[PDB]
A paper describes a structure:
ATP citrate lyase (ACLY) is the predominant nucleocytosolic source of acetyl-CoA and is aberrantly regulated in many diseases making it an attractive therapeutic target. Here, we report biochemical and structural analysis of an ACLY-D1026A mutant demonstrating that this mutant traps a (3S)-citryl-CoA intermediate in the ASH domain in a configuration that is incompatible with the formation of acetyl-CoA, is able to convert acetyl-CoA and OAA to (3S)-citryl-CoA in the ASH domain, and can load CoA and unload acetyl-CoA in the CSH module.
The symmetric ASH domains reveal an ASH active site and corresponding CSH domain containing bound (3S)-citryl-CoA and non-canonical CoA, respectively, as in the symmetric structure. Multiple rounds of 3D hetero refinement classification on the asymmetric particles (ACLY-D1026A—substrates-asym-int and ACLY-D1026A-substartes-asym in Table 1) revealed a large amount of conformational flexibility within this domain. The asymmetric ASH domain did not contain traceable cryo-EM density for a bound ligand, but instead, the CSH domain did contain cryo-EM density that could be tentatively modeled as CoA +  citrate, although (3 S)-citryl-CoA could also be modeled. A superposition of the ASH-bound (3 S)-citryl-CoA/CSH-bound non-productive CoA pair with the CSH-bound non-canonical CoA reveals the mutually exclusive nature of these two binding states. If the ligand bound to the CSH domain is (3 S)-citryl-CoA, this could represent an “unloaded” (3 S)-citryl-CoA, which could not form acetyl-CoA and OAA products in the ASH.
Residue numbers in the entry:
A (entry chain C), C (entry chain A): 827 to 1099
B (entry chain B): 487 to 643
D (entry chain D): 827 to 1010
Write the structure that this text describes.
């Protein structure tokens, strides 16, 4: 009653900017859901609205969708898929299994997109040439994130990388960071044939290029979005598809409880302590 | 009205109970005997739901189904005429009688040692009036080289 | 070396059926990634490959994408978004915040899709007519999951339901369970205006119809995918987008650590126990 | 400021009963922390206060601590420890690794305690004798939760079981369900 009459002022403890469910219609960052669907804005457009509050151009939305498709799954041997499979075979529900798989996504697994974007952006923002960047990384004892494949070396490129590169070339207006990364890739492939631009490095540099050149973000907005972990979100959302697929697959195969073999574990315990 | 032949080159078997080593030895014997297909078609285990279990056909992997109830395995494997019952002495009687409820099974091997003699008598009566041969209880089984092997008969490879 | 020479057999402890990464090309359920991209499969097609190992028709993929879009976010008031915002304001990373939000998804929050699909499938498979089904639900004192919303009702419909229903009307070949749910909705709305079909109930019944009538599934395959929680996965994947958007929003707004006000908590403690 | 003058009423959206920290002294379910420490409670007593809001006798607290000790770890081969190790080797922090391990705790892994207690209590509450309970579980094709060991058959008993059972013998006032399970 006091709030209705205006006698009392009480600060709101929460601020939100991505969605408004109070009104007659659901609104995604200023755009009603009917307007979202009438404008044929797919998953990429809704993702742009909910993550950046921007109506990205159609090519940007399609590129985001492609980035989600390429990172959807990469087999069951990776740490996250392994954990999801273990949790599914332990009889847990979908949320627990997917969550257990996702909790491994960090620096060593899944952080290559964000790390590669940060490294290439840091090099490109400074004036150092690609060769100076390669020599600086080598001198610091740091491998270039987003460079290096296990098998794909030369004349047999990574096909996901080629698909994303073709889309970025024929649709993006300007990709300075992609050109910088490709010069770095030329240098490193001169060093060693398999040191090609990963899907992680390509996605990172092309995402930075999209943020900086789609015409929707200022330089500081794009820098902030890269810093707060938008590419981590891209990888997590993409890989959630594969993790849920793995959970469903283990449920359908009716796999039983997993126990790791004792012969694969090296028990090295203190003798007396 | 029993049959004069009970193991064949193309015979199939249902194993009652979870005996992975026994059926794996069966499959090794089948592969070495140049059998076209494995002799164990399915397994019955009341304490786990229907699923499939990995086994080695020579150097490759195959899936043998495991059923809660004898009824389902009986239905979807009409080519099976042999049942190897690894049920203990307490459940050998019920499992054997339930198997004798099905006419496709002509041979039943009973492995359990220590079945009371009266229950064994009733098994003999049911088998005799059903025309089903019984490799008697408290046995290892039997082996027809090149065709079939019961359980742990003859050891491993 | 022994495996290469074939002298040793060791059983494989894991089975997978959704993705193969060992070869030259990444494969999504027996389908190469370039073949995925060249015939304009979207997130829906990749989702179908990874979750069902099936080549879904185009309208099924578009409907899956629409389902992921409509469930993307529903404001910060819901339990999962609340938890994600609290964890984000506590200085945690994207994975931890999204995970804390997702772990609330279950029976009470987000589980109406799977429960609605299960109940409507059970009612339709049995011979009970919609009126008999409503009466039987009334007798047991069990609410029909997928029926009833607070703000929206007849004459002010839920527009997400309208969009999804229109797509299913003009694209799906046959929707028996949707028609059954519509009859139940008519009965309940004549009983009471706010008892309309939810987005959860609509998505559940239309997903069952899509599985049973797209031609890519047998009856028992569709039944087992419904049973193992494919709709749980649909809701979780949809809402992960909104939760990541909330995390990015909270990081961009630089919101501080949250503590619930004491005046909102009712302390009722033992006397000296 | 209007709340400091008693001019506004607002309903409380949350209820809590385990701990009060607004006041000068921390209170664990009606008991101050100094009172908790001065009467030589331990992990078990604080656990009883926080989970049950009850003053458990000293033997109950010691038994709870023993239960925490025996279930502390069972090697790295189990599902939860495996997941924790995988997440730790992936470079994640302590909370994420422990979380990823804990999320496998459920029916197949770690739920044998609750399932065993539930089914033994359901049998004991009914009048069925242990023999009839065994036959009933056999008929439904359902193994008895809490029965079974890969090793430790006879004359070499499981030692954690031995320690806990001996403590429950020599300290508990009455163990009806334990005797029922022992007959089973
Ligand atoms: C408890 C129960 C699983 C007994 O299991 P079991 O089949 O007798 O033995 P296990 O399942 O532990 O495994 C059998 C073998 O695998 C071995 N094994 C166990 N873990 C292993 C690992 N990580 N790596 C390699 N080998 C392992 C065991 O040493 C054992 O060896 P053996 O074949 O030489 O005896 C069974 O009786 C049961 O399910 N009971 C229901 C009650 C219950 O669930 N109790 C709670 C569990 S604490
Ligand atoms: C959505 C929901 C929580 C709103 O319920 P609500 O605000 O309490 O609705 P009401 O104010 O009408 O109160 C409940 C009354 O309507 C009836 N009712 C409410 N939801 C019902 C349902 N899903 N099926 C049948 N009857 C329902 C109750 O019988 C009750 O009747 P009464 O007032 O004669 O006792 C409720 O409809 C519900 O639980 N729905 C099922 C779960 C669900 O669909 N989840 C939401 C998906 S987004
Ligand atoms: C520890 C430290 C936060 C002191 O806190 P403070 O800012 O003086 O006061 P608090 O943060 O406790 O909270 C402010 C007031 O709101 C009140 N309050 C706290 N939580 C509340 C809640 N959930 N609901 C309502 N009121 C609350 C408190 O009673 C406090 O009372 P005050 O007005 O007498 O100060 C500050 O000295 C500090 O940051 N030091 C660094 C060392 C450190 O981080 N220690 C960790 C603490 S375990």
């Amino acid at each position: 009653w006091a709030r209705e009459l205006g006698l009392i002022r009480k600060p709101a403890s929460f601020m939100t900017s991505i969605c408004d469910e109070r009104g007659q219609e659901l609104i995604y960052a200023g755009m009603p859901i009917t307007e979202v669907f009438k404008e044929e804005m797919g998953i990429g457009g809704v993702l742009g609205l909910l993550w950046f509050q921007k109506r990205l151009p159609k090519y940007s939305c399609q590129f985001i969708e492609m980035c989600l498709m390429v990172t959807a799954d990469h087999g069951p041997a990776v740490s996250g898929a392994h954990n999801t499979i273990i949790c599914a075979r332990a009889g847990k529900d979908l949320v627990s299994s997917l969550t257990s798989g996702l909790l491994t996504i960090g620096d060593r697994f899944g952080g290559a997109l964000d790390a590669a974007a940060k490294m290439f952006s840091k090099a490109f923002d400074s004036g150092i040439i690609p060769m100076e960047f390669v020599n600086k990384m080598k001198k610091e004892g740091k491998l270039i994130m987003g460079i290096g494949h296990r098998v794909k070396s030369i004349n047999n490129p990574d096909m996901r990388v080629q698909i994303l590169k073709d889309y970025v070339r024929q649709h993006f207006p300007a990709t300075p960071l992609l050109d910088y990364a490709l010069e770095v890739e030329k240098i490193t492939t001169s060093k060693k044939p398999n040191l090609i631009l990963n899907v992680a490095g390509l996605i990172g540099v092309a995402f930075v290029d999209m943020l900086r050149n789609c015409g929707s973000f200022t330089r500081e907005e794009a820098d902030e979005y890269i810093d707060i972990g938008a590419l981590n979100g891209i990888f997590v959302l993409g890989r959630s598809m594969g993790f849920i697929g793995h959970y469903l697959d283990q449920k359908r195969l009716k796999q039983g409880l997993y126990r790791h073999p004792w012969d694969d574990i090296s028990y090295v315990l203190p003798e007396h302590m | 009205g029993k049959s004069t032949t009970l193991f064949s080159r193309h015979t199939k078997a249902i194993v009652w109970g979870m005996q992975t080593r026994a059926v794996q030895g069966m499959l090794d014997f089948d592969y070495v005997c140049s059998r076209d297909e494995p002799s164990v078609a399915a397994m019955v285990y009341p304490f786990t739901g229907d699923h499939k279990q990995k086994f080695y056909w020579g150097h490759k992997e195959i899936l043998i189904p495991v059923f809660k109830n004898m009824a389902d395995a009986m239905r979807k494997h009409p080519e099976v005429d042999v049942l190897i019952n690894f049920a203990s002495l307490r459940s050998a009687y019920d499992s054997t009688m339930e198997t004798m409820n099905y006419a496709q099974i002509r041979t039943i091997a009973i492995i359990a040692e220590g079945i009371p003699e009266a229950l064994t008598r009733k098994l003999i009566k049911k088998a005799d009036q059903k025309g089903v041969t019984i490799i008697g209880p408290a046995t290892v089984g039997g082996i027809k080289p090149g065709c079939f092997k019961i359980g742990n008969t003859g050891g491993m490879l």
